């Protein structure tokens, strides 16, 4: 093991394309750009979504919906997360302390995702019908 006996893993270091370095390379002359047109040019090529002047898809289709401000401050808690809080009480504050939800989350819902195997008190959070069954199955309480 010396500085001149270390190799990278096979396949880890592919050589970069070098365009315009002769016939042998396979990328000589035009450098893989073909012949002429806008796409051959330095800085050449049409913007994203441009379809040649045809009304593009993102303009011929209608806008829909609005963005909810409430959704940004609402989170989902997995059953797996219930055992990651300290003390076995799952509140908004205990989830925030355990870094399960962000600090600005005002509303949180426990869903049936993953599993729970401890008696956890859930307080102040919504709970799905499946999550409620799972929490109660493992001896927990859903305080509203």
């Amino acid at each position: 093991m010396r500085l001149n006996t270390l190799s990278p893993a096979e396949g880890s270091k592919k050589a970069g394309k070098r365009l315009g370095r002769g016939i042998g390379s396979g990328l000589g002359k035009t450098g893989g750009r073909g012949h002429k047109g806008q796409k051959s040019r330095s800085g050449g090529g049409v913007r994203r979504g441009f379809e040649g002047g045809q009304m593009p898809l993102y303009r011929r289709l209608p806008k829909f919906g609005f963005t909810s401000r409430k959704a940004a401050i609402t989170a989902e808690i997995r059953l797996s997360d219930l055992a990651k809080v300290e003390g076995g009480v799952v509140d908004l504050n205990t989830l925030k302390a355990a870094n399960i939800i962000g600090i600005q989350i005002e509303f949180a819902k426990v869903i049936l995702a993953g599993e729970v195997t401890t008696p956890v008190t859930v307080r102040g959070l919504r709970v799905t019908k499946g999550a409620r069954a799972a929490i109660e199955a493992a001896g927990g309480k859903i305080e509203e």
Binding site: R48, G49, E51, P56, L57, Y58, R59, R60, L61, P62, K63, F64, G65
Partner: protein
């Protein structure tokens, strides 16, 4: 710098569970009286972006 979302595309397409995009159908803004109820009814639900167009949508929505 960060790629900029094409904001018009972000108002037209929502990404689905398997990474497709839903959109609202064209042809249901106006000139509705002449259109059959059946035609309009089929235009109400959201539809998926077709394979030909996904490349164009993905380009426009790098942070979708």
């Amino acid at each position: 710098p960060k790629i900029k979302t094409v904001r018009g595309a972000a108002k037209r397409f929502k990404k689905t569970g398997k990474g497709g995009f839903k959109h609202k159908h064209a042809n249901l803004r106006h000139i509705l009286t002449k259109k059959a109820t059946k035609r309009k009814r089929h235009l109400r639900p959201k539809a998926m972006v077709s394979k030909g167009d996904l490349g164009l949508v993905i380009a426009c929505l790098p942070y979708a």
